[PDB]
Write a protein that binds this DNA or RNA. Structure first.
Ligand SMILES: Nc1ncnc2c1ncn2[C@@H]1O[C@H](COP(=O)(O)OP(=O)(O)OP(=O)(O)O)[C@@H](O)[C@H]1O
Lengths: 444, 85, 109, 96, 97, 96, 109, 80, 96
DNA sequence: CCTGGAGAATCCCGGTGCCGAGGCCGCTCAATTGGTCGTAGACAGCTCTAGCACCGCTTAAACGCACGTACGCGCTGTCCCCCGCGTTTTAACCGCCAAGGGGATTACTCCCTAGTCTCCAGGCACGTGTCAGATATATACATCCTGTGCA
DNA sequence: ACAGGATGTATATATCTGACACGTGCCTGGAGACTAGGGAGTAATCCCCTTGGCGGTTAAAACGCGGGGGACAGCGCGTACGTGCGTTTAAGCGGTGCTAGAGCTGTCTACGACCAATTGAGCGGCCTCGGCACCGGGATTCTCCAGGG
């Protein structure tokens, strides 16, 4: 019902048929007065679509009113740069800094109101809620919709307290653990529609009620590029020391109040515990690697990869072992790159992008389930190694599809090391059942 | 290799915190040796109260210490607390 | 038929639960039998004490230019009053603070 | 539905409205008054129980309550509370 | 050249400020960790309600404040201004600990 | 004859001859011991009564006595007292 | 026919009267009901405490070269033991006296 | 009659102090000791008289004194 | 002439009275004081001798403990002679 | 300024009276045995609330450091106040007698309280909306502290 | 000894929010009426124990006096704490995930209250003797001058 090609107001524009038809879809939703979720799963892109939508709104019938975009603090510079280098004609401001800087910024920019789009983080939004409420908001963009996936959370209640002429939601995997978080998202979208919580009951009902307010397509069935990743599980066994650790802790001073957690990373590595942690720091030598079967497997796999690609990028679950392995790779006879929550927010975006190099010969990059955000594709990566899996299959999906952006024109292999007769089997089965629920809800 | 213990929990009671307590009491100048003595006194007081509270919780055949248990222990020691039950 | 029910608090002119006090005396293991006048007398004494402490606390809250009563106001009322201080000598009032006092030798001169 | 809990809150509020009509109370203040009333009740009841046990008597009466008040309350408070209790018992007996 | 207060004024200012406010002065998390460590010796596998730790902190702060009052009295008795462990020990000895 | 009075004097004498076979006790010391036994009985029984009320029960039991002994007596006294009471209850149930 | 009357104190092998303790528990209004083992436990505890204090007093009387325990011997025994001292911290023993101690500063230089 | 606090004499106060363990006594201690003794005795006797008046008797007994002292937290052993 | 140094007789008296266990105030003056104090609370009040003896015992114990605490305070102030200020400090820290 | 005697005060050994402790008797009341019955709590089952182990971001708070100034502490002189001793007066102490008050016991009666059944209204849980308070922000006042003259 | 400057603080004003006060429904515990029974009031009696007094005695208190040591004020000093300032850290709040464990329900038994009959355990009343208090005398020890060490 609209143009089939890119509008003549975008700059550096290479948006394809999927993005132009999504733009037409969003504009039609705006015309008929319907909000919704841009459930673009993967590389096809959502920042381009959101920016193009806002730019179309300005460059067509004059709606210069307030507009707000919510991003994690790890993507503020990225989003501002995308806005500048895609649609420079649109005006954007950023609310970031300490108390004095934020007060100065609101006083010198927000109340004068020369802005059209404001890019803020969740934390700053919570900080200056009384400041933002004084405006008649029109369009609200929330990235990573699973942040507000539940009610009774301060951000969700605050963002409901705002009044906007239109709403818009952005996510990668709208369904995570159950239909109630999806119902929470839909409640934020349309408060007056899905007021109630409630084979024919589901699946079909979900499809027919989500088609009007959602767009779903797969990069595999759209781009036909980006050769598929191959996932292989390696069933490993735990050493006898780990077995006796596991049995003794399960049947039993060190505080033990959480059976599942305390009997978790056991299969990963025993000395991840305290009490019998490695004692005197004699030196960093061949001590930690010998104690774990999974560590043995990784140390065997590394040569087979360095006789080839040697640009793996590794994944593990616990931040301790994350930093342990990070400061271990450098010692062993390798080099690394750093990505974890310790790193100050603004420095990471330039640092990691700079570390993306034509050649590094460093052989190691480490990223956890919760060490990275949404960007920086490692097209140079070739192998994905998952030391342990998280409860939520969506987190692992995001982790392993982080390197599956377009940059990756080569097939990539994911390795999932798994032990036996331990809690990791329960983690795997829960993840599999959740993934099956997600597939039956969305794909079918 | 990176594995060590940072501090003990009695050092969580901080010198500026003890100085604020002394200011509320009404003290002007504080000697340097007050702090370890105050930590010891607080440790003794808490050990007594916690022993009594755990005794009550064990009689209840529970495993969670409640505000009621703390109030009963304090009333036993003669330091009735109003506002918790 | 039967007569219209009058609460014994209404009978005694009180505003405290004579019936509930009677039940608590009977169930608290303080004796075998309880006289009828004992809950009435106990409720009257409780009412007087509550009224006294509340009056002092309300005066303090007004002195602070406030219309609600907080534990700070309650502590400030209980202290500065000798009889109530003796009655509540060994009692901590949560979030009530301490009486403002400085020993006169500490004041500079 | 949670199990009901009994408290002196409504009566404390009525006494407050009687003494300072245009004033309010806070939730923590109400909890403190609750504990205060329970404490005073327990102290007076225990004193009366010990009195009755000392005198080889099996009933708690207004005499026992008055003696407990005299023992536990310091002076002028005791005098005024005794006047209050006498007036209340007189009213309860005169026409009830 | 920069303005400095003579020793014995900022202390009085803090005295008035803290004798006027009613907040708790010890940090909550270290106190909770200390409470858990102490309770670990008597009986392992113990959970705490959040209200229990607040009650414990209230009682501890009140006890310490009263103790410091009495310690100040002892120090003033000795014709001094600085409190000492001797004053603390004497106050505890008289109060019966 | 005058009305009978009760005391723990004969049992105190039995325990004295049990522990020290060649010692006697004066009347004032016996009165002191009697009052001591009464006071300890009062403390333990009152604590057990408070425990039963706190846990919403109507029976004083050996567990309540044990808990009261733990609350009231310090340290090694408590350990020995609990051991002695447990032996007594064990033997009483065994021989009943 | 009936068996010979065996005392509960005999059954538990004690010297304190289980029957008297049971009657005192029932007539004291501590609770509605009293179990079978509680009097036995309480009697054993009372006997243990009495034995402790009597042993300490007998040793004290032996040190003083007598054969009759008196309140001075009881006071010496109770104040010379830390556990019993904390148990009886708020108690006065008639005709007991005080522990001999002189602060080391009063002694002549 | 009256003037019976003077019956508590300076030599008796000195004996009490020497049992306490003190060596030197200031000249103004005696009036202070008389005052504190008067306060203590007044409290205890008032409680005992309340107990006796509740009993509807006219004679104050050792039981009354002991009960009052126990109420004040000053338990006395050796009188019943 | 033989005169002891000023302070040895004091230590001899300290030892003698800390070894003795009998009362130190005179019984008739104490009894007259007790009756004088009881005169205000009720007229024509009779006494038992055991009551007066117990009152004297408790008064002496209280005063002995008071003097011990006073000595501690005076030694803290680097003195040897106890003072009214020391007595008042002891009473204030105890809680009067 | 380490010894050596006077000279008070204390401990140790032996003899005498005496009075309270300990053994012994009768008696009565309270503990034991036996049996019956109702209820309190033990036991199992399910719900959902709340606690524990963990991460990112903000930012107040803690930590560490350098400078100087009151302050605690040691030392000295003064004098005054308390102690040790002797003497005189006072009253506690003790033993005994006389008398009445009042505490304790016994029986008798009756009024008040326990227990029951029924009914009904007062008190509690749950929602909901509006205002009292906390927050921030900019004046005006009060307080401290230093510096330049001449007190 | 004040003037002025910088600092901290009290005060007036406008916004926004979460907690308190009010209403509504509902149910469980209190009020009305009644019946039995035993605890307490009342009277009367008895005896013991409290008070009042009187005299003789001796220990204790009151008074004076001389003198030594301890309290108190002053002075000097050299050091440990208060005050301010930069840098790091960890608390606080927010989300995440999970499962234990506290709390309510229903059933069933075994345990303690109640009663009746019996009897032996403990209590008041007696008496005799050895342990203790007192008295006296000798040996021992601590203190305080005075000197020659
Ligand atoms: N100029 C462009 N021309 C074509 N495709 C583009 C362009 N810019 C971005 N893309 C698409 O975006 C992919 C990677 O971009 P980017 O990682 O920024 O995506 P995104 O919008 O953040 O997506 P996601 O929905 O996963 O968050 C590319 O593989 C490509 O498919």
């Amino acid at each position: 019902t609209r143009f089939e090609d890119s509008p003549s107001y975008v700059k550096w524009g290479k948006l394809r048929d999927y993005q132009v038809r999504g733009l037409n879809w969003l504009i039609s939703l705006y015309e008929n007065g319907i909000n919704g979720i841009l459930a673009d799963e993967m590389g096809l892109g959502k920042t381009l679509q959101t920016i193009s939508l806002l730019g179309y709104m300005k460059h067509y019938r004059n709606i210069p009113g307030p507009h707000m975009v919510l991003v994690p603090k790890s993507t503020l510079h990225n989003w501002m740069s995308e806005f500048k280098r895609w649609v420079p004609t649109l005006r954007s401001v950023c609310l970031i800094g300490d108390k004095e800087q934020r007060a100065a910024f609101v006083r010198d920019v927000l109340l004068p109101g020369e802005w059209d789009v404001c890019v803020t983080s969740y934390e700053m939004l919570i900080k200056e809620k009384s400041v933002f409420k004084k405006f008649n908001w029109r369009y609200l963009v929330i990235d990573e919709a699973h942040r507000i996936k539940n009610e009774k959370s301060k951000l969700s209640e605050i963002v409901r307290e705002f009044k906007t002429t239109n709403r818009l939601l952005l996510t990668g995997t709208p369904l995570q653990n159950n239909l109630h978080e999806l119902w929470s998202l839909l409640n934020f979208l349309l408060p007056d529609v899905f007021n109630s919580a409630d084979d024919q009951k589901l699946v079909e009902r979900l499809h027919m009620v989500l088609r009007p307010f959602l767009l779903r397509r797969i990069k595999a069935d759209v781009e036909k590029s980006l050769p598929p990743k191959k996932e292989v599980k390696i069933y490993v066994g735990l050493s006898k020391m780990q077995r006796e650790w596991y049995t003794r802790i399960l049947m039993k001073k060190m505080r033990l109040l959480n059976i599942l957690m305390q009997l978790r990373k056991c299969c990963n590595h025993p000395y991840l515990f305290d009490g019998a942690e490695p004692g005197p720091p004699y030196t960093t030598d061949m001590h930690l690697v010998t104690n774990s079967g999974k560590m043995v497997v990784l140390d065997k796999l590394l040569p087979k990869l360095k006789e080839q690609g040697s640009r793996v990028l590794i994944f593990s679950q616990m931040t301790r072992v994350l930093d342990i392995l990070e400061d271990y790779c450098m010692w062993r006879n390798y080099e690394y790159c750093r990505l974890d929550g310790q790193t100050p927010h603004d420095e990471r975006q330039d640092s990691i992008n700079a570390y993306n190099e034509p050649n590094s010969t460093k052989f190691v990059f480490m990223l956890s389930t919760r060490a990275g955000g949404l960007g920086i594709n490692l097209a140079t990566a070739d192998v994905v190694i998952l030391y342990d899996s998280d409860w939520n299959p969506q987190v692992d999906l995001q982790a392993m599809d982080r390197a599956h952006r377009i940059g990756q024109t080569k097939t990539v292999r994911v390795f999932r090391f798994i032990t036996d007769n331990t809690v990791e089997e329960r983690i795997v089965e829960r993840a599999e059942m959740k993934l099956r629920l997600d597939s039956i809800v969305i794909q079918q | 290799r990176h594995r060590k213990v940072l501090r003990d929990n009695i050092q969580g009671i901080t010198k500026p915190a003890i100085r604020r307590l002394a200011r509320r009491g009404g003290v002007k100048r504080i000697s340097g040796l007050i702090y370890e003595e105050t930590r010891g006194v607080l440790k003794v007081f808490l050990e007594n109260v916690i022993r009594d509270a755990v005794t009550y919780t064990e009689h209840a055949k529970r495993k969670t210490v409640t505000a009621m248990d703390v109030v009963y222990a304090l009333k036993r020691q003669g330091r009735t607390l109003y506002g918790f039950g | 038929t039967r007569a219209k029910a009058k609460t014994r608090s209404s009978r005694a002119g009180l505003q405290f639960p004579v019936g509930r006090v009677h039940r608590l005396l009977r169930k608290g293991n303080y004796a075998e039998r309880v006289g009828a006048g004992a809950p009435v007398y106990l409720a009257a004494v409780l009412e007087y004490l509550t009224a006294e402490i509340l009056e002092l606390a309300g005066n303090a809250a007004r002195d602070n230019k406030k219309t609600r009563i907080i534990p700070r106001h309650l502590q400030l009322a209980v202290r500065n009053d000798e009889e109530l201080n003796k009655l509540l000598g060994r009692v901590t009032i949560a979030q009530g603070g301490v009486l403002p006092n400085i020993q006169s030798v500490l004041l500079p001169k | 539905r949670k199990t009901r809990k009994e408290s002196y809150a409504i009566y404390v509020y009525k006494v407050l409205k009687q003494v300072h009509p245009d004033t309010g109370i806070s939730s923590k203040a109400m909890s403190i008054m609750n504990s205060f009333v329970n404490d005073v009740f327990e102290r007076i009841a225990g004193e009366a129980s010990r009195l009755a046990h000392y005198n080889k008597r099996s009933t708690i009466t207004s005499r026992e309550i008055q003696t407990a008040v005299r023992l536990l309350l310091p002076g002028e408070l005791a005098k005024h509370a005794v006047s209050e209790g006498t007036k209340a018992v007189t009213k309860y007996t005169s026409a009830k | 050249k920069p303005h400095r207060y003579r020793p014995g004024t900022v202390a009085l200012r803090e005295i008035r400020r803290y004798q006027k406010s009613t907040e708790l002065l010890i940090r909550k998390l270290p106190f909770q960790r200390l409470v858990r460590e102490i309770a670990q010796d008597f009986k392992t596998d113990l959970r705490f309600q959040s209200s229990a730790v607040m009650a414990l902190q209230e009682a501890s702060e009140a006890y310490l404040v009263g103790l410091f009052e009495d310690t100040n009295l002892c120090a003033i008795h000795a014709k001094r201004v600085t409190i000492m462990p001797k004053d603390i020990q004497l106050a505890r000895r008289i109060r019966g600990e």
